Amino acid sequence: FCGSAMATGKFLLAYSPPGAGVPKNRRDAMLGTHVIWDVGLQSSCVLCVPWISQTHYRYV
Amino acid sequence: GYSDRVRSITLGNSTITTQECANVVVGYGVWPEYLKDNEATGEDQPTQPDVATCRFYTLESVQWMKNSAGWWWKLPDALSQMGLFGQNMQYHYLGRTGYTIHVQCNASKFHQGCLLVVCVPEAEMGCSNLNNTPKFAELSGGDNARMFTDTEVGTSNDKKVQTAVWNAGMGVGVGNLTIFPHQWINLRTNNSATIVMPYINSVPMDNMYRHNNLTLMIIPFVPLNYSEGSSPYVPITVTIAPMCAEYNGLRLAS
Amino acid sequence: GYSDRVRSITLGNSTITTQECANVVVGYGVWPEYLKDNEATGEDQPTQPDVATCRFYTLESVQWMKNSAGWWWKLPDALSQMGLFGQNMQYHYLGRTGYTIHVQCNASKFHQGCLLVVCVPEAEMGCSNLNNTPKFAELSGGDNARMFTDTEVGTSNDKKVQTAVWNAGMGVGVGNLTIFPHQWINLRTNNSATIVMPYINSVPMDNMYRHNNLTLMIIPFVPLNYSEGSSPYVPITVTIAPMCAEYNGLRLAS
Amino acid sequence: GAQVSTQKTGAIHYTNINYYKDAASNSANRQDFTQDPGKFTEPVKDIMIKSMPALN
Amino acid sequence: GAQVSTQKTGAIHYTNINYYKDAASNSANRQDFTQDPGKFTEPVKDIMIKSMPALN
Amino acid sequence: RVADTVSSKPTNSESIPALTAAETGHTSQVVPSDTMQTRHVKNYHSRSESSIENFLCRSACVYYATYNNNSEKGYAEWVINTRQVAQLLRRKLEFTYLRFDLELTFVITSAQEPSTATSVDAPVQTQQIMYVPPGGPVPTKVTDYAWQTSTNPSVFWTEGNAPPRMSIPFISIGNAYSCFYDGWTQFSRNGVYGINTLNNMGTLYMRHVNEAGQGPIKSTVRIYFKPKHVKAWVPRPPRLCQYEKQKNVNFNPTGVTTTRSNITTT
Amino acid sequence: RVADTVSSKPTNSESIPALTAAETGHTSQVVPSDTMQTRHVKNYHSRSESSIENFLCRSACVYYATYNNNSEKGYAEWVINTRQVAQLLRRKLEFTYLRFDLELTFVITSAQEPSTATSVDAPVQTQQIMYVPPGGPVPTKVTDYAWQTSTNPSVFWTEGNAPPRMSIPFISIGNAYSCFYDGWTQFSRNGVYGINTLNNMGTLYMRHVNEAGQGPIKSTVRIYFKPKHVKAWVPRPPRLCQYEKQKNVNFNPTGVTTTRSNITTT
Ligand SMILES: CCCCCCCCCCCCCCCC(=O)O
Ligand SMILES: CCCCCCCCCCCCCCCC(=O)O
Ligand SMILES: CCCCCCCCCCCCCC(=O)O
């Protein structure tokens, strides 16, 4: 977050594996893997997309 | 231990990290645990479901206006439609869980305000008309916030709950609501509030659709304010995580 | 060991007891087990659900006529709508299970007949028209039996499966279908047939809605018969039990 | 690495060396015979001896 | 000078000899894997542990 | 391997190794010395020419594609698969999940075409057979940029010598090859159903390296596979109806066996 | 290779391995087991097909120059450099200072030309590809004195056999090759600025050894480099704009990436 030092806010970050994609609402995305990040004083937050696949590899 | 004011919570699949926060208030002094085999009466075997049920389901948001009174939620019912916690809630018949309530509200250094984040066990309510009893669509929202008012209740509609904020709707003194676990949100020096609640109830395992365990109440004791030239929209959100879930009595859905 | 011909099976919540039966054929020689942590590639944690999923779900029944050809079912799809096995099948994305197939068909000492209870792994099929490929509503029923015919297929409807019983529909010799595990039902000396099948598949865990594991086929090689003065209705039923279920990859429903 | 193994006689020895890095450059494992019939014939649970009657 | 070294298996040995005078006639050093990420990621002076906060 | 035999004498007990029940799905285990009295003969045979290691590891034709030298589109290409010839297809469909290596081999040939020039003297030709995995560049003419092969593996061979041969590891995505697939490719359960849903395997390109001539030559390549280190699981009954599609299992129903003019006729 | 994973349980402490500061130029070191609860799975993979030893050591085309047999100026020549093909150029520009050997290879080809004589019978041709380092003699025709090669290294090869191959040490002036140069060549800081200021590398000549014929034949050689023992220093970002000059870095500015019709569109 690169805003002023008086700025504030929280955010959500979701990764929904494919059974049905592009969640329209926020409550549709909150069921998948997610994290909650709030800004200020070391603002930068790291979301870790894990590895969840049947096979061992994937195609570029 | 360096820079106390930063926490981090990774429960299952989600992770919520705050940089400016107060301490964490942990229930009545206990951490939520499973049910021992010395106090159980169920004759079946339980079902510790997964990491897929102990996650961070975020509910709806609302606007902190300059005249708003207060909101509340019912805990075992608000998570009825969220993911695999709402499927193992209706397919089964029994269950016991604990939660990890969270709250976010962030403003600049030019705003002011306060809030009382508290959860009350076994929260009753009072109908508007004295004879009748409250409705259900006026007592619990479908994961959407219910809000107090300033005028008391009126005399309608013979089933509406009485939204008298200064009495809390339960029939007690609002200033005495600091007995149950809680935390304040002062925008001067605070940005969130965490609360860990165990399972408190008479019987070992109780239904989920017939009896609500807790109740989450939010009340701003000091209204928002700001001079001209600042963002006039301050929203609020809450993130809850079922902790140590269990179930029994498999049947058909409902 | 006294009176071999009596068995008894208590799996979870249901129990099926036969008094007149043959031996029990156990897969390719293995008992269904969980997935070791030396051959897994999923990065999440599995979910051994409950006793609430390893139960005896009984499917529909049918009439053994005097001209019927044969029925079949698709195993991972037939249990899609049954109890908490059909909820953890669609809410998740992966899974691996084994079954315990059962069959009931009882007649007096004045009837005659036979049947071939066999399950085929990776059963393909052939469309009626050569160019196109079979439909889906003509390949799998919603836990209702699909049946062969006597006339071959016709030339319709460019998507219907070819119900040529003497070729089995897969394109092989029907007499050679005794390689896969199986058991006969001879009404002279038999009353049921039990089969335990492990999980056989290339990858460790596979989807449930995109790829069907097995296929259960029933074919009477000797038609029913009876003299005048006996009950002319002989029905058939099947009872299946998922064994050692597991899942991964929680998402929304479908 | 050279091994002096046996040959296929009706009823001697023969040397062999590998010259590459991978394992897909060797020759087939023709001289290997391992049998087990119990998986396909007799998959039953209870063991049945041919002397005793089949069903009681 | 012959060395009997290992091969690349999925989860044996294979001989090798050099026949020339120079060193540019040998084969590539494919069977060598050495990793060190610290040079590019995390070049900072003070060491930072992921538990403690980043900046005070 | 085979086993010996044992000497039997007359018996009158109640052993009865003959009568059994076949409903239990159990093949019997009666030997000839149990049902009648026989001699003792020690067999010296050996079950060696029948194991899967010796039964499959022989080369067979798969596909022969030709490419003329006339124009700028002379080159020819082929998509990898093993269900294009009847002999080697049915030798795979007695199992379900295999695992093997391979040793390719290309027997290239040539031939002349009519022309009008006075004399003809064709030097030897060269190839240049390329391999493009799935998801990569592609050539469109015999003078393209793709023929550099900076990372693709190619084979150059001049006519007149022995044919080219090479090996191939177990290149796949799953833990074993799958010869039968039961299910679709889209999660909506619509569209493609057959076995080619999990078969890409790459491509294969061929080309003349020589500039041009006066013939001009025409050529035909022939592929040859040889599964080396086999492993088979889950056998199944062989095929009874002819093949009629490359990526289906469609058939035409036929009689189970040829017919004789009686039940008791020999 | 890769590392395993570790089993994690629910936590409520103040560890916070997620929130950090990115101003310090420090990439994080968070693994998936830190932010959420996961299982324990031991990875068996291996980072082998990605090391610079295995990534670079493949042959690729560099330059193909042809030379007719007609006249006294048939021979053809080439000045050494590696920035003449796009495929192998960009596979070098992810580093700054390299160090390697090489294994040359020349795939020579031939072809006929129109003529009027009655018959034609062309015996095999031979070459004769020479190497002249910088500052040495030079040939001007196909019958010169320079073709004696008293100290120069030459290669003689008759058409029809396998192609010629040979090695090359780390022949340079500095302690490592330089793929990017920032600065001029004259001390007055005027004139030439680019990378070719420190690139001479010699020359390369080719020629038909046969006397003559009636065709007459035309030929085209093709070079192939294969860096053998690599060592790389100081990586840098890859290229984004096409190449347009052989000894410059001139480009035409383009968009950073293709475009989608929205920010939230998938
Ligand atoms: C010049 C070298 C080229 C090497 C080409 C490799 C060919 C790959 C062969 C793929 C395996 C055969 C197919 C098995 C199963 C199927 O896809 O039907
Ligand atoms: C017949 C043998 C001849 C051998 C010719 C040797 C060729 C020398 C190759 C020079 C190295 C490649 C260029 C690297 C850096 C550059 O100059 O761009
Ligand atoms: C490239 C191999 C050259 C031919 C082999 C000559 C014999 C050299 C000694 C080999 C001994 C290796 C050890 C062994 O016997 O297996």
Ligand SMILES: CCCCCCCCCCCCCC(=O)O
């Ligand atoms: C020119 C080499 C001929 C082939 C090699 C035959 C074996 C001779 C013995 C070589 C032993 C060298 C020492 C070593 O093992 O490294």
